[PDB]
């Protein structure tokens, strides 16, 4: 699967998940031109590639996206929290 829940309002999302897929699953409104995946989305939004083990976040609307797992410079897994 491209994502899994871990707790109320909190999920792990594979970097390869399409932004459009994420919006369909989660009822969100993310958009970014010339970028198709959630890995590309978060990397672009952060503006810098995190070190392995470094877990910066980007907030947008009621969502917080965290770089949960890097494999070299590839963003493998995002953590997503939803707020009210
Ligand atoms: Zn949490
Ligand atoms: Zn740093
Ligand atoms: Zn390192
Ligand atoms: Zn390494």
Number of continuous helical runs: 2
* Helical fraction: 10-25%
Measured distance between first and last alpha carbons: 26 Å
Beta-strand content bin: 35-45%
Query: What's the main sheet like?
Result: 5 strands, antiparallel
Class per helix and strand makeup: alpha+beta
Protein name: Hemolysin
Subcellular location: Membrane
Binding site for Zn(2+) 4: 54
Binding site for Zn(2+) 3: 52
Task: Walk me through what this model shows.
The chain has a 5-stranded antiparallel β-sheet, covered by helices on one side. It has 84 residues and is an alpha+beta fold. It has one domain (1-84): 2-Layer Sandwich (Uridine Diphospho-n-acetylenolpyruvylglucosamine Reductase, domain 3). It is built from 2 helices and 5 strands. The longest helix has 9 residues, at 38-46. The chain binds zinc ion (ZN) (4 copies). One zinc ion binds next to loops. It is found in: Membrane. Zn(2+) 3 binds at residue 52. Belongs to the UPF0053 family. Zn(2+) 4 binds at residue 54.
Which short descriptors sum up this protein?
84 residues; alpha+beta; Uridine Diphospho-n-acetylenolpyruvylglucosamine Reductase, domain 3; 5-stranded antiparallel β-sheet; globular; binds zinc ion; Hemolysin; toxin; hemolysin domain
Blueprint of the fold:
Blueprint: E1 3-7, E2 10-14, H1 19-26, H2 38-46, E3 57-60, E4 63-71, E5 74-82
Antiparallel strand pairs: 1-2, 2-5, 3-4, 4-5
The structure holds zinc ion (ZN) (4 copies).
